[PDB]
Amino acid sequence: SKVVSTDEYVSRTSIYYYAGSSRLLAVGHPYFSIKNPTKLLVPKVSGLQYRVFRVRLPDPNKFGFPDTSFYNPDTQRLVWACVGLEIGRGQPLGVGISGHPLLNKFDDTETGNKYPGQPGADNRECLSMDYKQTQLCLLGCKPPTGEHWGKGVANDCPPLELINTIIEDGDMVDTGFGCMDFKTLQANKSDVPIDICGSTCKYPDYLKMTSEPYGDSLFFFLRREQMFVRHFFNRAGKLGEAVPDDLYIKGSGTTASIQSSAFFPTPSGSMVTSESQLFNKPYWLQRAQGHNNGICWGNQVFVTVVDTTRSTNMTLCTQVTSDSTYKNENFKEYIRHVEEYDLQFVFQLCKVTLTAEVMTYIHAMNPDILEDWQFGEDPLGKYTFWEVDLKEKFSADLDQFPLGRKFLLQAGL
Amino acid sequence: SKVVSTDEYVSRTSIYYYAGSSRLLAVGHPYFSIKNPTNAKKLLVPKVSGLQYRVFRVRLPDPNKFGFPDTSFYNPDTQRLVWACVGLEIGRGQPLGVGISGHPLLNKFDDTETGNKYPGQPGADNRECLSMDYKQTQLCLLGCKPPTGEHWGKGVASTNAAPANDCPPLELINTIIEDGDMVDTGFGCMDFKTLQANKSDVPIDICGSTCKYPDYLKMTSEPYGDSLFFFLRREQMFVRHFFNRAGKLGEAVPDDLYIKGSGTTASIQSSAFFPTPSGSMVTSESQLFNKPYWLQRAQGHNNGICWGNQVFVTVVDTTRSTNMTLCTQVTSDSTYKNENFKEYIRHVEEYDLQFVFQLCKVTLTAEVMTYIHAMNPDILEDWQFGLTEDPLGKYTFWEVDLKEKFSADLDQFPLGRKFLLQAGL
Amino acid sequence: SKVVSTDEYVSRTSIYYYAGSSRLLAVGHPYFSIKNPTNAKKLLVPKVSGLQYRVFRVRLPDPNKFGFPDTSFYNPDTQRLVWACVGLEIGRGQPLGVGISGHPLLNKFDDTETGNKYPGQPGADNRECLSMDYKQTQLCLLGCKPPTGEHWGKGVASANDCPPLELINTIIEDGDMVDTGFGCMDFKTLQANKSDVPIDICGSTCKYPDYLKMTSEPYGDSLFFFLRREQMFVRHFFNRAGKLGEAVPDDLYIKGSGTTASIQSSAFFPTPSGSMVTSESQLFNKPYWLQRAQGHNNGICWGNQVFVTVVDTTRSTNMTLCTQVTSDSTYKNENFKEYIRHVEEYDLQFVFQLCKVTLTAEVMTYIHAMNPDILEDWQFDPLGKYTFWEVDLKEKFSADLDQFPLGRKFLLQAGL
Amino acid sequence: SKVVSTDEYVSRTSIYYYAGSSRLLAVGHPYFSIKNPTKLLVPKVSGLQYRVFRVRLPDPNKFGFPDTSFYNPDTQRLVWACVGLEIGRGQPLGVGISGHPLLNKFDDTETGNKYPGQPGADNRECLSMDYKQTQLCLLGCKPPTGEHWGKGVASNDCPPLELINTIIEDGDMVDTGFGCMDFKTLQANKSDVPIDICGSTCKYPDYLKMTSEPYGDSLFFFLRREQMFVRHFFNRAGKLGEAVPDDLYIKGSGTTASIQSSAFFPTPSGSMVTSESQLFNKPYWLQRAQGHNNGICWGNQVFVTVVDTTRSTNMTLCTQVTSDSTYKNENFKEYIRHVEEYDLQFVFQLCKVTLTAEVMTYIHAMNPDILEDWQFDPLGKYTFWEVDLKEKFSADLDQFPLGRKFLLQAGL
C-alpha cells in the first residue's frame, strides 16, 4: 500500500522509562576462536567485529503498570518507542594489530624491485599491520543488512556476486581489503591476515536499508571511517591475467620474464582521538528519516556497533620454568582482547488505536504484530546476536540514571 | 533512598572564598624509584613520570570551625556548613614536550611491518634495546571521593577437570587510583607484573607496575555522584611499528587458517604480534589546563558539594613528559672518553591548583538527617558535637592542605579575578 | 596594601599617539658567536638564532615633559601623566621557514627505535655528526616589567653522583635561548661532556616563561597580555654512551647471559621536531587591542617604558653561504668555504593612550607602596645589569594616527 | 604632505564594467630556459615563479560612453576603481619536484654519521626535493616591492649581507625553503641549491614596506598562505668557513680526531595540496582597502601579482628515436615541461574627480604624471606579463560569471 509515518497512527504518551544493560564484557582471542578438545573454549573477540545487540523489551501490554487507566485494552494496544540512546564504551582508546605468519607477500614495490625476480615455491613472509579505522552505530527494530562479495555461479577467475545477508554478532567488518568472502575468493588462505582469511567481511548496505519502505532497519545511524595506504606489495603465484602487449615494450635478458603486477596495499587507520568518538554521548531520536519514527515493534530493538578505536590487544606471558637467566624456552606468549559496553536507553510509551483501517495497514506491514497482540518459531533464531534482556530493567525514575537525567534536561523535563 | 539533587537540601550563600596551593613540585626518576640501601623504607629518588596519575587530596578548613567575621548568616543550633566548589584552574608549569620509555632487554624479535622472510632463527635470548613514545593522555577529575580505576589482573581458574591451557584467566579489577599510579600507555590497562612473567614485554617503567584506566562508566552511574562533579579527557595514539615476540607461542594458529609450509617455511613464525604506540604531537591548542572551569551544574546529583571538607583532583598530563638528560664528569681529560662521564635521567612536574569555593548551609531537619545518613553517615558524625581513623589512610595521595589558605579577597588572585568577571560581580 | 585596578586611580583621555620602530634587523651566526681573535673582547659575528628570546626595551617620552601643542588638559599642580598601551602589532619580515641545529660530535650511541641487537659495542668515542629541527614556539609578552623565566640548574649538593636539581627564576634577557625540546635547563652546568645537545644550546641556558609566577604577582606589571603556541613530536629514539649513573633495578628484568650478559644503556633520549609552519597559525603581523587586561595593571606603562618579549621559530631559516677561494674549471671541495648566517626582521607598532593620575593623599600612599620610583621621577636603574634590545621611541610619537597602518586600524576598531 | 583617503576627493558613479583576459597560457621548462645557437626557444616556466600581470585599462576620459552627461570634462576627469577580482586557475592540483644532478650533499645526518668522515675531492650527489608551498595574491596600481639578501660592501671571508628591495618582475623566483637570497652571488659553487634557483634570486614580498608606504598604491589588499616542514637533514662538503669554538665541545681522538662539517642544511617539503586551502577561483570584493588608495587605478593600469605552487606538476614527455622490439634506454629521449593556466576577471567602477585648486595641489604632490596624462613609461626596464583589456570592457555585467556574482554581492 502507501506507507505513512508512525506519527499518523501511533499516539505518544507522557510516560517515559529508562533501561540499562549494565556492564557488558567480552574476553577472547582477537584472531581465532579456540575449540574444545572434545562449543568454544576461548571465543574470538576482536575490535574489528560487528556487535549486534538484540535488546529484549518487556511487553507493555503485559507490563505491571501501577496505573493502566491511560488506555483501553479493548480497542488499543501498547508499544515502546525509543527516544534516547547512549552507547557506553569502557577500556582506553588504542589500536590493535593483525597479521599472518605466512602472508603471500613477495617483494616491496614502493621504491621499486630490480630485475630479475626470484619466485621460488614458498616465499611467504611473517607480516602484520593495523587495519582501517571504523566507528559506526545503527538502530532499528529489524536486524541490520550487510553487503559483501562472494563467489557466484559461472579465464578461470571466480565470478563476483554482491550478496546481502543479515549482519550477526561477531561478523567481521571490512578492514581495508574490501567486503568479501575471503574463504571462498582467496583459496591459498594467505593473502589477508588470519583473523579474516577464513571469514567474510561485511559492509552495511546503507543504500538498501534507507530505501526500504517502512524504515525498520535504520531509525538513525552514525558512521566514521578512515584509512590510508601504508605499504606497497605484490603477490606470489601465477598472474591469472597477464598485462596486454600494447601497454609495455617487452624486455630482454634480465627483464625477459615480467614481474608480477598483482599489487596489494596494507591499510592503516592512522590515529584514534577522543574528539572523533561517536560513543559515550547521548543521541535523541526526535525525527527519524524513515517512516518508522523509532517504534519498537515486537518489543525488541537492534543496536549494531563497530568500534576499532579500542582494539588494543593485551600481551599475556606465563613462566613455565623459573631460572636465574632468561631463556626463550621458559615462557609462553599469549594474546587477549576485551570489549566493554554499557547500553542506555530512554523509552516512550505509545498506544495504538486498532481501527479497521489501522489493522489493515499493520497487517500489510507485518502480520505478526497483530498476532502477538492477540488480535487478527522465531524466524531470527537461525542467526547469532548478543542477547540483552531488559524485561526486568525498566524504571520510571528517570533522574536516578545518567541518561535519564540528560533526557530530563534535553526535553526540558 | 531516592537520590535528589543537592540543590534541594543545600542552601547557597553569597560568601565566596579563594584558595591556592602555590607551586607544587615533584622531581625524580621517570622509569623507577631508587631505594635506600639502608633504613628506613625511604627513597633516594622517587619515581616521577609524565605517565603517572596525580591524585591530590585537597584538605579544606572545617567551615563549622572557621573564624568568620560575621556568623549571623546561619543558625548553628539547626544548621551546618559545607564548602561547594564553583571554580577550578589546574596550573601547569614547564614547557610542552614528549618523553620516552624503553627496555634494554625488551622481548622484541623481528620487525614484521614489511615482512620477515623465512626461516626465522630464534636463539636462547634475542632481546633487544629499544625505546618508544607513549600514547598521549590529558585528563582531569574532580569530586569529593577518590577516583575509581579499572585494570585487568590475574583471576582464579576453574581446575575441574584438568587444565585447559596455561594462559592466565583475566579479571576486571576496580581499585582506587592513587597518586603515582601509571596511566595506560598503549598496551592496555593491566597488571603487567602478574600477567607478563618475563619482565621484558613492555618498557621498564610499567613492566613491574599496573596501568589503570578511569572507570568512567562505573563512576558516572553510581547513585549519588560524589566521584565526578565533572571531567575532561583527551586521548590520542597511532601505531608506529609492528613487531612480534620471542618465546613459545602459547596458542597455535589453527590448521584451517593456513596451508602448511615446507623447508624454509616448515617452522611457522610467531604470530604473537605487538605494536609500539605513539602519541603524535603535543600542541597548545589541545591543552586542557591553565584555563578555568566553572562548575555551574554537575551531571550527577552532587552539584559540587565537598563533603568532609575535602576535594580530590585527579590529573594526567603526558604533554609535558620531557625527560632531562644529566651528565657528570668523573675524570677531567682533554679528549673524550666514554668512561669519564656518568649519564642520568630526571623528570619534573610543576602544578598549581587554584579554586573558588562557595559557602553553603544545611538545615538538619528530620527528613534531611534520614537522607544524609543513607547517603553518607560520616557527614553527620563530623557535624555532631554532643547529643540533644582515616578511612582512606591505607591509600597514597598527594596531600594538599588549604586550611590556612582560604581568602575572602577574591580580586587579589588570578582565578578570583576571573570568577568576578564570569559571574558578573 | 590591597591592590586595586588602575581603572580606579588612572583617568583616561581622548589623546592618542602612534609609534613605530621601523625595520629592525639582526644578522649573525645561529649556533655560536664569533669573538675577536686579537686585541678585542668584542664580537665580529653575533649569535642570532630563531630559537632566541627577543626582549625589546621600548623607551617612551615622558609625557610630563612632552612638547604638547596645548597642555591645558591636566593640572600639573595636582596631576601627572602616563602612557597606556591600547594597541600593538609585531611586524615580522622574511618568509616562513624552519632552521636546523646539530652537533658534529653528539653523544648518540645506537638507534633504539626498531631495536638494537646484542651485544653492544661501547668503544672510547662513538659520538656522531647529527642534526635536528627543534620544537616550534611562538610567544608574545607585554608589560612594563621585564619578563620572568624558569630553568633547572645545579642545586645544593647536600648517595650517588647525580646533580641535585633546583628551579631557578631569572629575568629573560634579549638573546636567551628558548626551550627546544630538551627542557629548560642549564646545559653547560648539567651536561659536562658538552655533547648531549646541539652546540647552539649545549653551552647555554634554555629558559621557559614562568607564566604562573608572572600572572600571580600582585600588581600584574609583567603580563598585560600574552599569546603562545608551542608544538612538537618525537622524531627519533636514541640512547647515550657513557656510564649509566643509576642502574636498572634487578626486580625489573631477568638477567641475560653470553651475548646479553652486559646490559645496554637505558639512558634514552628523543630528538624533537616542530612539524610544519603555516600562515594560519601565525601570531604576528596582526594587531592586538588591549581593552581589559586580566591583571590589575590595565596596560599602564609606569616609568615611560614597555617590554615586548617575542619568540618566533617559524622564520628560523638558516642561509647557506659559499665562497670560491680558487677559480677552477672542475669542481674541487678545497676551493670553497662554507658559511651559515641567520637573520631576523622585526617592526614594532604601537598605539598609546594618554592618561592622567590625580595625586591625592590616598593615591600617593598607594603608588608609593606599589613602586616608590614612580612618584620621584614625577617630582611629586637596577635593570642596567641586564641585556635588552633597546628601542628608542622618544622622538617617534605622532598624533596623526591615520598616516600609519596600525593607526588606521585603530581608528576603524574604536569607530573614531 | 598629509595623506587622505581617496573617498574624500574621488566621487563614485553607478556605472560598472566587466573585463576578462580569457585563457592565459605559459608553457616551458621548469628548471631553465633554452637559448638558440644563434632568441628564446623554450622559456623557463615553473610553479615557483611570480606571475606579475600588468593590466592595461582603457582611458575613461577617451572611452566611448553611450551617454557622457554624467560629468563635466571642463572641470572633471575620469578614473577606474577596482571593486571585484577573481583569479581563475586551470590545470589540476599537484606538486612538482626540483633537484640538482650535482648537489653539494655530503652525509645524511638525521640518524647520525659515524666517525671517521671521508671527504674526497668531489662528493656531490644527484638529489631532488619538493619545495615549500606558497599561495599569494597582491593587487595595486604600482608593481609590488620584494625583498631579498644580496652581497653587501666589504669592510674573515664570510660575505657581508645586505637587504635589497627590488620590483618583483614576472618570472622572478619565490622563496622555496632556502630563504630569499641571491643564490648566484652568495653560493659560488653552483651546487648548494637545485638548478632552478642556483643561478637566480628568490624574492619575498616586502609586505612591511608596501603597507607602510604613505599612499598605499602597492597593496589594495593581499592574501597569502605559506607552509613547509623539514624533510631531511644533510651537511655540506667543502671547507668549514667558521669552525666550532673550542668551549662548545671536548676534543676528539683517533677516529674522531678530525671534526666533521657542522654546515647543516634542510630539505623543505610543502606537504599536501588541498582544495580547501585554495586562495584562487573565488571572488574578492574590494569594499574598503587598508591603505588610503581605496582601489583607484591611477594611470589606467593595475598590477596583479600571483604565486601558486599548488599546480606545480611537471609533465614527463618521452620520444622514441628508434623502433625496436625490445626496450633499450638509448632509444628514448626524456623531456620535462611545465604549464600554467590563468584567467583574470575584474569588475571596475567608474569614478570622477573634480579638479579644484586643493585637489590639483594634492594630486600633483602625490603623482605629477596623473595631471599631465589628463592634459588638464618609467617601467619599460621591467618585465611583466602584459594583459590588454582596452578592447575587453563590457557594461553587460550579467553576461559573465564574475559579473553575475557582483550583481548578487551588491544587490544590484
Tab-separated table of N, CA and C in Angstrom, chain A residues 23 29 32 90-93 95 97 99 101-102 105 122 124-130 189 197 230-231 270-274 315-319 326-329 331-336 338 340 399-400 402 405, chain B residues 3 107 112-118 123-124 126-127 135 150 152 165-167 172 184 195-198 201 213 215 217 235-239 242 245 247-248 250-251 254 256-257 259 261 265 269 273 275 280 299 301:
chain	number	residue	atom	x	y	z
A	23	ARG	N	27.173	-3.352	32.808
A	23	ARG	CA	28.424	-3.737	32.165
A	23	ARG	C	28.243	-4.970	31.288
A	29	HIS	N	40.100	-14.232	22.146
A	29	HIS	CA	41.249	-14.158	21.260
A	29	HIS	C	40.914	-13.312	20.044
A	32	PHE	N	41.338	-15.774	16.253
A	32	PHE	CA	40.596	-17.000	16.001
A	32	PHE	C	40.022	-17.502	17.315
A	90	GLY	N	33.735	1.163	27.619
A	90	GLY	CA	34.844	1.150	28.541
A	90	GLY	C	36.154	0.857	27.829
A	91	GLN	N	37.216	0.751	28.637
A	91	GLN	CA	38.583	0.475	28.204
A	91	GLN	C	39.181	1.690	27.502
A	92	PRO	N	40.498	1.866	27.556
A	92	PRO	CA	41.115	3.034	26.919
A	92	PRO	C	41.078	2.948	25.402
A	93	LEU	N	41.272	4.106	24.776
A	93	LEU	CA	41.466	4.147	23.335
A	93	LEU	C	42.799	3.498	22.987
A	95	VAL	N	44.943	1.033	19.506
A	95	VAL	CA	44.930	0.372	18.207
A	95	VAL	C	45.562	-1.006	18.343
A	97	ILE	N	46.639	-4.843	16.250
A	97	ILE	CA	47.388	-5.291	15.081
A	97	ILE	C	46.923	-6.688	14.700
A	99	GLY	N	47.843	-9.907	11.649
A	99	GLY	CA	48.893	-10.328	10.749
A	99	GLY	C	48.718	-11.764	10.316
A	101	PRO	N	51.546	-15.190	9.887
A	101	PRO	CA	52.927	-15.702	9.846
A	101	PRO	C	53.348	-16.183	8.472
A	102	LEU	N	52.396	-16.468	7.584
A	102	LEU	CA	52.676	-16.945	6.234
A	102	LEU	C	51.842	-16.150	5.229
A	105	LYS	N	53.092	-12.292	0.656
A	105	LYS	CA	53.780	-11.069	0.277
A	105	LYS	C	55.111	-11.457	-0.346
A	122	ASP	N	57.801	-21.255	-2.157
A	122	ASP	CA	57.130	-20.751	-0.959
A	122	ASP	C	57.946	-19.576	-0.426
A	124	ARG	N	56.391	-17.016	1.322
A	124	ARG	CA	55.534	-16.325	2.271
A	124	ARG	C	56.359	-15.769	3.425
A	125	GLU	N	55.925	-14.621	3.940
A	125	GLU	CA	56.651	-13.920	4.984
A	125	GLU	C	55.714	-13.658	6.153
A	126	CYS	N	56.314	-13.368	7.304
A	126	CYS	CA	55.570	-13.048	8.516
A	126	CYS	C	55.393	-11.537	8.585
A	127	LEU	N	54.169	-11.071	8.361
A	127	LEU	CA	53.901	-9.648	8.244
A	127	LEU	C	52.649	-9.323	9.044
A	128	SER	N	52.588	-8.095	9.552
A	128	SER	CA	51.466	-7.647	10.362
A	128	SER	C	51.188	-6.183	10.053
A	129	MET	N	49.995	-5.735	10.437
A	129	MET	CA	49.513	-4.431	10.010
A	129	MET	C	48.411	-3.968	10.951
A	130	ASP	N	48.121	-2.671	10.897
A	130	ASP	CA	46.963	-2.113	11.577
A	130	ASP	C	45.888	-1.807	10.544
A	189	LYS	N	44.524	-19.121	1.381
A	189	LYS	CA	44.369	-18.818	2.803
A	189	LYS	C	45.498	-17.947	3.349
A	197	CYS	N	40.998	-14.226	6.985
A	197	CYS	CA	41.295	-15.067	5.828
A	197	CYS	C	40.374	-16.277	5.728
A	230	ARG	N	49.649	2.311	3.669
A	230	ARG	CA	50.909	2.355	4.401
A	230	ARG	C	52.060	1.713	3.630
A	231	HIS	N	51.827	0.583	2.959
A	231	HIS	CA	52.893	-0.092	2.230
A	231	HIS	C	52.365	-0.665	0.922
A	270	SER	N	45.525	5.243	10.903
A	270	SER	CA	46.078	6.498	11.444
A	270	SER	C	45.686	6.570	12.927
A	271	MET	N	45.327	7.741	13.443
A	271	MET	CA	45.191	7.946	14.876
A	271	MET	C	43.747	7.818	15.336
A	272	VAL	N	43.594	7.360	16.576
A	272	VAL	CA	42.328	7.397	17.294
A	272	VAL	C	42.402	8.560	18.270
A	273	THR	N	41.320	9.330	18.366
A	273	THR	CA	41.290	10.522	19.204
A	273	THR	C	39.964	10.587	19.946
A	274	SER	N	39.966	11.325	21.055
A	274	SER	CA	38.737	11.490	21.821
A	274	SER	C	37.705	12.329	21.062
A	315	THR	N	49.089	-8.417	25.741
A	315	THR	CA	50.089	-9.476	25.724
A	315	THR	C	50.144	-10.141	27.095
A	316	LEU	N	49.868	-11.441	27.138
A	316	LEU	CA	49.976	-12.220	28.360
A	316	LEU	C	51.148	-13.184	28.224
A	317	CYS	N	51.874	-13.393	29.322
A	317	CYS	CA	53.102	-14.183	29.291
A	317	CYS	C	53.225	-14.985	30.578
A	318	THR	N	53.300	-16.308	30.456
A	318	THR	CA	53.483	-17.180	31.606
A	318	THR	C	54.897	-17.747	31.619
A	319	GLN	N	55.376	-18.069	32.819
A	319	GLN	CA	56.686	-18.678	33.013
A	319	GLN	C	56.507	-20.157	33.326
A	326	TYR	N	67.561	-15.536	31.532
A	326	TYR	CA	66.447	-15.543	30.595
A	326	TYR	C	66.671	-16.589	29.512
A	327	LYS	N	65.671	-17.442	29.306
A	327	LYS	CA	65.667	-18.411	28.219
A	327	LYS	C	64.303	-18.388	27.550
A	328	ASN	N	64.298	-18.266	26.220
A	328	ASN	CA	63.041	-18.196	25.479
A	328	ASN	C	62.173	-19.424	25.716
A	329	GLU	N	62.788	-20.569	26.004
A	329	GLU	CA	62.042	-21.809	26.179
A	329	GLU	C	61.267	-21.856	27.488
A	331	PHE	N	59.083	-19.426	28.601
A	331	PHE	CA	57.912	-18.566	28.606
A	331	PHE	C	56.980	-18.912	27.456
A	332	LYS	N	55.686	-18.777	27.724
A	332	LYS	CA	54.644	-18.928	26.721
A	332	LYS	C	53.992	-17.571	26.494
A	333	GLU	N	53.776	-17.224	25.228
A	333	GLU	CA	53.238	-15.922	24.858
A	333	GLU	C	51.780	-16.062	24.445
A	334	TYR	N	50.926	-15.212	25.012
A	334	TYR	CA	49.500	-15.222	24.727
A	334	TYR	C	49.033	-13.835	24.311
A	335	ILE	N	47.893	-13.807	23.621
A	335	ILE	CA	47.234	-12.575	23.210
A	335	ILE	C	45.766	-12.653	23.607
A	336	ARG	N	45.248	-11.570	24.187
A	336	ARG	CA	43.846	-11.491	24.569
A	336	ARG	C	43.299	-10.110	24.240
A	338	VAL	N	39.644	-7.568	24.839
A	338	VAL	CA	38.447	-7.355	25.641
A	338	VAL	C	37.615	-6.233	25.034
A	340	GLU	N	34.208	-3.705	26.332
A	340	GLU	CA	33.359	-3.282	27.441
A	340	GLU	C	32.283	-2.349	26.906
A	399	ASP	N	15.439	10.308	36.592
A	399	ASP	CA	16.532	11.103	37.163
A	399	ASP	C	17.441	10.298	38.085
A	400	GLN	N	17.243	8.988	38.215
A	400	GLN	CA	18.113	8.138	39.014
A	400	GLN	C	19.211	7.488	38.186
A	402	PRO	N	22.087	8.185	34.637
A	402	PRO	CA	22.731	9.280	33.883
A	402	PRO	C	21.964	9.718	32.643
A	405	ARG	N	18.745	11.565	33.469
A	405	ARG	CA	18.941	12.958	33.858
A	405	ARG	C	19.156	13.841	32.637
B	3	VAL	N	17.528	9.329	45.190
B	3	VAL	CA	18.561	10.348	45.245
B	3	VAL	C	18.005	11.604	44.614
B	107	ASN	N	61.536	-7.917	24.894
B	107	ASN	CA	61.240	-9.101	24.090
B	107	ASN	C	60.681	-8.658	22.736
B	112	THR	N	57.972	-6.938	11.631
B	112	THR	CA	57.048	-7.558	10.689
B	112	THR	C	56.201	-6.527	9.944
B	113	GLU	N	56.756	-5.341	9.685
B	113	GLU	CA	55.979	-4.300	9.020
B	113	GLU	C	56.031	-4.443	7.504
B	114	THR	N	57.208	-4.726	6.954
B	114	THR	CA	57.344	-5.042	5.539
B	114	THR	C	57.535	-6.531	5.294
B	115	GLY	N	57.594	-7.333	6.344
B	115	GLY	CA	57.680	-8.777	6.214
B	115	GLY	C	59.032	-9.302	6.664
B	116	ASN	N	59.017	-10.464	7.312
B	116	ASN	CA	60.233	-11.155	7.727
B	116	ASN	C	60.305	-12.477	6.973
B	117	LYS	N	61.305	-12.614	6.103
B	117	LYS	CA	61.436	-13.817	5.293
B	117	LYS	C	61.871	-15.012	6.132
B	118	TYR	N	61.475	-16.193	5.674
B	118	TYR	CA	61.784	-17.459	6.309
B	118	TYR	C	63.185	-17.913	5.901
B	123	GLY	N	67.278	-17.975	18.713
B	123	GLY	CA	68.209	-18.479	19.706
B	123	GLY	C	67.650	-18.484	21.119
B	124	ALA	N	68.529	-18.482	22.122
B	124	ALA	CA	68.068	-18.580	23.504
B	124	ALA	C	67.609	-17.239	24.066
B	126	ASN	N	67.025	-13.364	22.422
B	126	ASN	CA	67.072	-12.411	21.320
B	126	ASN	C	66.548	-11.032	21.711
B	127	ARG	N	66.511	-10.723	23.005
B	127	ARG	CA	66.015	-9.427	23.446
B	127	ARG	C	66.918	-8.304	22.947
B	135	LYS	N	51.312	6.686	24.252
B	135	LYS	CA	50.050	7.326	23.915
B	135	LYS	C	49.870	8.603	24.727
B	150	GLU	N	39.982	1.104	36.534
B	150	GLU	CA	39.811	-0.268	36.077
B	150	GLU	C	41.105	-0.760	35.449
B	152	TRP	N	43.085	-4.884	34.238
B	152	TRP	CA	42.983	-6.331	34.120
B	152	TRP	C	44.081	-7.002	34.937
B	165	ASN	N	44.523	-24.826	29.418
B	165	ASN	CA	45.752	-24.251	28.890
B	165	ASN	C	46.331	-23.368	29.982
B	166	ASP	N	47.623	-23.075	29.871
B	166	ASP	CA	48.290	-22.335	30.935
B	166	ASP	C	48.102	-20.825	30.811
B	167	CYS	N	47.284	-20.367	29.865
B	167	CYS	CA	47.019	-18.941	29.737
B	167	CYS	C	46.309	-18.435	30.988
B	172	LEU	N	38.492	-8.254	35.474
B	172	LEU	CA	38.423	-6.797	35.501
B	172	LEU	C	38.344	-6.330	36.950
B	184	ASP	N	47.426	4.161	31.437
B	184	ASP	CA	47.628	3.286	30.292
B	184	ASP	C	48.477	4.007	29.252
B	195	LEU	N	50.797	-10.530	34.951
B	195	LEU	CA	50.332	-11.107	33.695
B	195	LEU	C	51.428	-11.264	32.650
B	196	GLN	N	52.607	-10.685	32.868
B	196	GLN	CA	53.742	-10.829	31.958
B	196	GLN	C	54.952	-11.238	32.791
B	197	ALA	N	55.235	-12.543	32.817
B	197	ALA	CA	56.210	-13.088	33.753
B	197	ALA	C	57.650	-12.791	33.351
B	198	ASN	N	57.927	-12.631	32.058
B	198	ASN	CA	59.306	-12.487	31.609
B	198	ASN	C	59.891	-11.109	31.891
B	201	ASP	N	58.308	-7.636	28.160
B	201	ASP	CA	57.415	-7.369	27.039
B	201	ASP	C	57.028	-5.902	26.910
B	213	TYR	N	43.037	2.555	33.973
B	213	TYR	CA	42.217	3.462	33.202
B	213	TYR	C	40.995	3.846	34.023
B	215	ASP	N	37.501	4.258	35.443
B	215	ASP	CA	36.224	3.595	35.196
B	215	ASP	C	35.149	4.677	35.135
B	217	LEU	N	32.506	4.722	33.346
B	217	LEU	CA	31.162	4.156	33.341
B	217	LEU	C	30.670	3.892	34.759
B	235	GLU	N	42.538	11.739	24.648
B	235	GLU	CA	43.491	10.684	24.341
B	235	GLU	C	43.749	10.628	22.841
B	236	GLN	N	44.981	10.279	22.472
B	236	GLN	CA	45.301	10.049	21.069
B	236	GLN	C	46.539	9.167	20.964
B	237	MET	N	46.565	8.332	19.926
B	237	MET	CA	47.711	7.473	19.649
B	237	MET	C	47.548	6.851	18.268
B	238	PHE	N	48.671	6.397	17.713
B	238	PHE	CA	48.683	5.592	16.497
B	238	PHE	C	49.805	4.565	16.591
B	239	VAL	N	49.798	3.620	15.656
B	239	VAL	CA	50.777	2.538	15.629
B	239	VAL	C	52.005	2.989	14.846
B	242	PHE	N	55.552	-2.412	14.079
B	242	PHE	CA	54.853	-3.695	14.117
B	242	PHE	C	55.897	-4.771	14.393
B	245	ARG	N	56.877	-11.319	19.187
B	245	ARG	CA	57.540	-11.762	20.405
B	245	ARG	C	58.388	-13.007	20.177
B	247	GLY	N	59.787	-16.539	22.206
B	247	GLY	CA	59.252	-17.492	23.158
B	247	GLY	C	58.227	-18.417	22.519
B	248	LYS	N	57.767	-19.376	23.322
B	248	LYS	CA	56.793	-20.351	22.844
B	248	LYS	C	55.449	-19.678	22.598
B	250	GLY	N	51.838	-19.688	22.897
B	250	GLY	CA	51.005	-20.447	23.817
B	250	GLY	C	49.809	-21.102	23.152
B	251	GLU	N	49.231	-20.442	22.153
B	251	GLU	CA	48.074	-20.960	21.431
B	251	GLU	C	48.387	-20.904	19.944
B	254	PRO	N	45.179	-22.274	14.345
B	254	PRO	CA	44.504	-23.497	13.896
B	254	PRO	C	44.848	-23.831	12.451
B	256	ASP	N	43.049	-24.790	9.903
B	256	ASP	CA	42.155	-24.384	8.826
B	256	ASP	C	42.372	-22.945	8.377
B	257	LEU	N	43.310	-22.223	8.987
B	257	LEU	CA	43.575	-20.834	8.643
B	257	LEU	C	44.811	-20.657	7.769
B	259	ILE	N	47.724	-22.994	4.867
B	259	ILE	CA	48.247	-24.201	4.238
B	259	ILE	C	49.677	-24.376	4.722
B	261	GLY	N	53.541	-25.067	5.385
B	261	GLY	CA	54.725	-24.852	4.586
B	261	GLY	C	55.656	-26.046	4.623
B	265	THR	N	59.831	-22.743	5.277
B	265	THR	CA	58.592	-22.377	5.946
B	265	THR	C	58.015	-23.518	6.776
B	269	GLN	N	56.352	-18.983	11.963
B	269	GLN	CA	56.894	-17.916	12.787
B	269	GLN	C	55.871	-17.478	13.826
B	273	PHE	N	52.063	-10.915	17.691
B	273	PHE	CA	52.417	-9.570	17.268
B	273	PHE	C	52.157	-8.574	18.388
B	275	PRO	N	52.268	-3.986	18.798
B	275	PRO	CA	52.654	-2.671	18.287
B	275	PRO	C	53.433	-1.844	19.300
B	280	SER	N	51.826	10.988	18.916
B	280	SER	CA	51.958	12.034	17.896
B	280	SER	C	52.371	13.321	18.616
B	299	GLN	N	26.498	16.974	36.224
B	299	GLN	CA	25.569	15.993	35.673
B	299	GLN	C	25.065	15.030	36.738
B	301	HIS	N	24.074	14.069	40.852
B	301	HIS	CA	23.208	14.739	41.815
B	301	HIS	C	23.984	15.607	42.799
